[PDB]
Amino acid sequence: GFVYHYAFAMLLGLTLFVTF
Amino acid sequence: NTDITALEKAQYPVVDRNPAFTKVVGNFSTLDYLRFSTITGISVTVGYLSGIKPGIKGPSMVTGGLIGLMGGFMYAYQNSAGRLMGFFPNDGEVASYQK
Amino acid sequence: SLVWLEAMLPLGIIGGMLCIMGNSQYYIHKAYHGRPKHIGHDEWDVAMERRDKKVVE
Amino acid sequence: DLIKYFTFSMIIFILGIWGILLNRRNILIMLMSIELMLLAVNSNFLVFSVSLDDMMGQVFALLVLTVAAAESAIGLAIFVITFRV
Amino acid sequence: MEKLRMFVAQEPVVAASCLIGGVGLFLPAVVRPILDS
Amino acid sequence: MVGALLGLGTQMYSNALRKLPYMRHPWEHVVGMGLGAVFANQLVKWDVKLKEDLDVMLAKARAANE
Amino acid sequence: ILSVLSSLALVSGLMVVRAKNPVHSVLFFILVFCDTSGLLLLLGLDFFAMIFLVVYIGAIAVLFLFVVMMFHIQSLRYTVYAGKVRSWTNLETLGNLLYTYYFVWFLVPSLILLVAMIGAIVLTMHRTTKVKRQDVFRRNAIDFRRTIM
Amino acid sequence: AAAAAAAAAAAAAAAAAAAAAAAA
Amino acid sequence: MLEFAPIFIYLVISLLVSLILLGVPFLFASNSSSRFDIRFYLVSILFLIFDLEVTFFFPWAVSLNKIDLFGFWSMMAFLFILTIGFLYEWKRGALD
Amino acid sequence: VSEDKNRNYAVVAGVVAIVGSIGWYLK
Amino acid sequence: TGNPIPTSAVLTASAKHIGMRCMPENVAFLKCKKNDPNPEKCLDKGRDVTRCVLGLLKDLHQKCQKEMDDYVGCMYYYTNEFDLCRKEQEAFEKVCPL
Amino acid sequence: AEILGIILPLLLGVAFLVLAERKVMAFVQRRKGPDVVGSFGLLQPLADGLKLILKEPISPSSANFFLFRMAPVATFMLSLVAWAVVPFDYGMVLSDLNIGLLYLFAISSLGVYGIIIAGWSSNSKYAFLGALRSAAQMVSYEVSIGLILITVLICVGSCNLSEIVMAQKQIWFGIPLFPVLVMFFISCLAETNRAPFDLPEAEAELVAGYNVEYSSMGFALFFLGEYANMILMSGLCTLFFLGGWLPILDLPIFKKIPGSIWFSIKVLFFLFLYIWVRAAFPRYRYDQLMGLGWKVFLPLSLAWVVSVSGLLVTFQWL
Amino acid sequence: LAVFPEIFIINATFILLIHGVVFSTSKKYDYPPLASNVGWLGLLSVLITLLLLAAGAPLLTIAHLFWNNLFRRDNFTYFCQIFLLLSTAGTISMCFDFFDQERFDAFEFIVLILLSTCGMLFMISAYDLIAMYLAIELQSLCFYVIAASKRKSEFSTEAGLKYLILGAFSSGILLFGCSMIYGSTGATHFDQLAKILTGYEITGARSSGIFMGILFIAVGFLFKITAVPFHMWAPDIYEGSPTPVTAFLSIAPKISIFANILRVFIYGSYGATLQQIFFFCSIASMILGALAAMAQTKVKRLLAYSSIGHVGYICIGFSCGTIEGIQSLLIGIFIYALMTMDAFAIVLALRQTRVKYIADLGALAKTNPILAITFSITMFSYAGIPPLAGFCSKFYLFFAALGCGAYFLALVGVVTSVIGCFYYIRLVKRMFFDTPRTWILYEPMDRNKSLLLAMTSFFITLFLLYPSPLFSVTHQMALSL
Ligand SMILES: CCCCCCCCCCCCCCCCCC(=O)OC[C@H](COP(=O)([O-])OCC(O)COP(=O)([O-])OC[C@@H](COC(=O)CCCCCCCCCCCCCCCCC)OC(=O)CCCCCCCCCCCCCCCCC)OC(=O)CCCCCCCCCCCCCCCCC
């Protein structure tokens, strides 16, 4: 479930990547 | 560019470095013509015996002979080349010392 | 006989449209830029255009 | 700027491997992510060939193109065979 | 050969492709080494 | 050499695995294995020669005591 | 501004791995390839942009669209004016290598395309030709004419 | 599909009338 | 690349043109007057392969004076392997 | 007192094999 | 065009003459650059090639200055593309410098 | 921008090509074509248009507006954007791409999408399988056009279309590679559908073979697309093989040699050839057609790449 | 020259492919099944190559044109390639029953094995990341195809599909490793990559690009050789696919990928920094092999996990970069390959069964007792029973691990090998001394399996009586690297 709970994880990861 | 310079080369006395085709094949010893002939036979036979079951004895024999020609000829070429070049026993230096 | 000219006329006014396709986008580009278009416009020419607009100050 | 064009490819590859891990159930998304990660390494080769100013990158990128394409061909053909009749 | 003519009649486009293509695999094979002069 | 005995076994062992009895002319083709054993021993000699050559090359390498 | 618009590819790649409707998955697949080709254009690799277009969104995602439609899932530069006198188009400077110097890595993808042909044939012939269209293979002398069932 | 394909080979064109050309 | 900007704007201006061609009929005219055909996967995979091999043809086509008679023969070996694949497909009967 | 083609060729090739190989292990 | 401003057109227009003349300066500059590509180490040879070539331009713009103006008009019109006007190229070369 | 100066005249070209086809293909059949509407039917295209525009829909169905109301837009935008790189005269290409030809190849590879999508959004099994068959045909005569372009590319230096038409100053590639022009034309006939090769375009199976929601705009846009794709694929048989904008070079006193007029004359010849060859030949049935793109125009195209590569490598003509 | 083993097996595959396709699609010959006729000529195109390859031993390095561009042959590549062709010879030989008895008219399975063998011949001699990847994917693509071959039984189709997914994803990881390494080094040739990666010391020197690259290459490889933390489908891959294709993609990719690892990881990058992942993989692979073998029933899946565990026992020879370690790894590949060809030859001898477990494997002590003797010999060999060859493999591997100071690696190896010895002794006892269990009867094996099983059974038992040739071969190969 945490592997599916990583939705916001990977999403906000991409966000904090595009911040730079 | 290209160059025939080899690793582990010239372990035996070279006769003609980088032999031209039509010479390295005109150097076939009666053993090479006997290697190119036994390979073509063992390839025609396995090409006929193989095809008796599906009824293709003739054409499977022909394709086994094609495989044998290609393979045994490239083997006779390997031998006569590693002989002309310094790679193999190369007792055919009399052909150079005489001609 | 010149009977085929009636059927040539639509091919003419479809040929008079490719002439316009070719010359419009030529004389429009010949207007925005004082010179015709350069076909073989490799990077040497963009570099020379840069240094050229930098030479005329 | 090379980092921008690489870490973006790196996280496209991470998306591919992520979809691989999650979608072990559905296979068409599996193949989607396979070609995704074979792009994120292909676009990676192209970016690293422009950066290093080296042509081996683009040669390898072209060969990966015409190898991942055959891989997708055989992949989808295997997938169509898997859904037998 | 009889079967060769039977093949260049029944299938003209794969027997005149292996001959409009021989002239391309044959010119650089022999005609180019001939052009040593 | 011992290759002759081994081949007759390989052929007989083969016959024992297909269920067939221990009989035929392939037991006379085990002489080919006798040729094979002689070649394998010949290749052992040639191989230890080449390995000694590579080993003296290594001894020359690895800082050569420095 | 089109430089940072690789975010489009980035989000469309997140779509394909987080989509249950396969049409959206293949659509954003095509989108990922279109934006990757846009990127490969911004880098000046023009040949690879068109090759991405062709052999991805004219062949491979065509395949994937088929698999969806049928079989639904449910300043300071110093430009050196040398080496610019003869600008080598990307195709020319891939061909100067791939076919003469690294040509075996080009004859091996030849074998990989040949294996792909053989594979698509042996897999998806689907018993529709000589693979099984040879015959039902029923012979008379080997039959007992059903007098004794 | 094993259906008989329409083989576009045949015998050459030879106009075949009936035997009543001259004298019935 | 510099010449890619005209087609970059071409895509958008042709989008506009087609949207106008779409909206023109919409405005006027008011109130009163087979399980599976796998051959489409074989044809598709085969086009994929042949367009890959055309992709390999393109650099060899544009750079053939550079690779004098060796690039040509390497491409002819690649093409003989293509031809062996194509003859295996012709004989097996995928072209139907 | 005859045979069929495509098999006498095979027997001649088998003879060529063993005669040829004899010459090989002989040299 | 105008004073001998070494624009793109006027340079690619006289490149034949910049080839016949000013070849020693060009080959010296190239020998330096192929020796070491640091810009400073032959700033002097750069001045030397630029000096003889600006001189060559001011020469070509004295005799046959109208001919050396129509040809650069070409080379600015068609961007340094030779074949597009061989007439101006000939008329300029024929009148004074061959 | 100046994209208007290449889309509007092309729209007029397609609208007048519907009339040019009806009229030429009628003259062939010993009958005057559209001849009452305009002075010589010259207004007949405007009449067809203004009729299709004023035809009330059969069902509004503006709900499904993102699926197949932009797919004809896509097909048409592709058929129109492949016109950028096509040069009408020296320095009249809108955007001289140094890889121009490969870009045309990619535009075709996207037209495949156009057809497949616009056929899948039509929820008609017969029409969808027809669109898939048409896409497989358009893409099977694309390997043959690919190899034909590899031939005309070997003859030329680069893919730059302005160079491919500049590489023919000595002789058009139609004269030495005439057998290739016949294969490019017979492929451009088959890549597009309008040809002896149009079983998916058999008069009835075409209309019921592209979409279910016509509304007229879809019918016109597909035909405007087919006729622009035709003007394009005839503007390629005249860049590559015929001299793109080159005269015969006799340099007449009567002829001041305009370039775009020569390109126009040649593309008119190939459009007239499209029409003539639609009139005089029966359809190929799509089962002999696909067996002509693989078994006939691929071997005869591969041979040509090896022939024009060989004969140009032996004698250093490259 | 220098490509005469490749030039031939590529021409021979074409001669066979055209010969097979023309006949199978022939009305005159009544559409015959060309399998076992393009075979036979297939496996001879192998032996003639193995004769073209073994003979020209000094000639393989005959040009420079290939050296700094494409691929570098040497004594290691030469000996390991004579082995791949020999192990491809066994694998085609054992299939001859699978072609006739099992209804396969698909000859191109043979020509695909031949193209895969050419891809592997180019893997062994691959000496550039690009060539390594291209040959890897050539062989992997032939194997995806011939593993998804059986279209009637859906069990082989989904197995081949997950094999394609696992292999394409492994190749994606390997290729991202190649990208990171190339992108961070600007050099793909192993001769060039070696000069850069001298004194790289990732754990001491900050180089994250090269580190992630070598890590992804190692992960892709450990996927291909189906090591423990990345096997992830390998049991189902070996079980679902047909038996001979399992015998192919289970022994030959191991040999080839392991030779490729010896190339990139002992010459392209040499450091104790990367072999840590292989040390962990060895530990967990021996663990998983032992335990899962203790757990499995299906003989195909039992051999799958046994092969995973033995691949583990291989990597302990790579877990230390000493010549003794590499030579132990090579000894381990030959004694794992010959033993696996034997086990798969046995599993192919029992065609009559469906997917059936060791219980149905029983009664072999009664029906065909010599085959049961051979099977016990092979399973003992895997276990490492002293008087056999697998013992020599595992023992020299453990001795190299001890001489390399990896005492804990030797410890986990010995405990796992003793667990395996117990399990296989118990299996042999259950098969011999009890458990009749339904007496399924078998059609006899053919001469081809018979000689391979017989010669290999002789090799396993009569190995310690003459280990000099193999030890000399592998030590020469290790020195050459
Ligand atoms: C102390 C006393 C000493 C005395 C002196 C000894 C001197 C030598 C002794 C003999 C040496 C070997 C002789 C030749 C090999 C024999 C092979 C064999 O056993 O065949 C079994 C074979 C079993 O199957 P089959 O009955 O053939 O029916 C086929 C099935 O239907 C098959 O199923 P299918 O219907 O599906 O068909 C598929 C087909 C598929 O077939 C294939 O694919 C076959 C491919 C096999 C590989 C290649 C074989 C041919 C070439 C061999 C190598 C030649 C080079 C040298 C050796 C290299 C290494 C082996 O299967 C076949 O079976 C095909 C034919 C099989 C035979 C192939 C080999 C024979 C032809 C070539 C002869 C080569 C001679 C080698 C000599 C060795 C020593 C130097 O039966 C026969 O062949 C019987 C007739 C032939 C033998 C005649 C009698 C022997 C003659 C010599 C005797 C001299 C010694 C006397 C001793 C006295 C005291 C005991």
Ligand SMILES: CCCCC/C=C\C/C=C\C/C=C\C/C=C/CCCC(=O)O[C@H](COC(=O)CCCCCCCCCCCCCCCCC)COP(=O)(O)O[C@@H]1[C@H](O)[C@H](O)[C@@H](O)[C@H](O)[C@H]1O
């Ligand atoms: C005084 C007492 C001792 C006297 C001497 C005693 C022993 C001498 C030793 C060896 C003799 C030679 C070979 C040993 C025998 C090998 C197996 C020969 C098998 C044989 O007949 O199939 C020939 C092909 O044949 C060769 O493929 C080629 C086989 C060539 C064999 C030629 C033999 C006769 C010529 C003379 C020898 C020449 C070589 C001389 C020097 C070397 C001698 C060894 C084809 O017949 P076929 O169409 O009916 O096919 C057979 C098929 O072969 C069988 O497998 C099937 O079971 C059967 O139903 C049928 O389909």
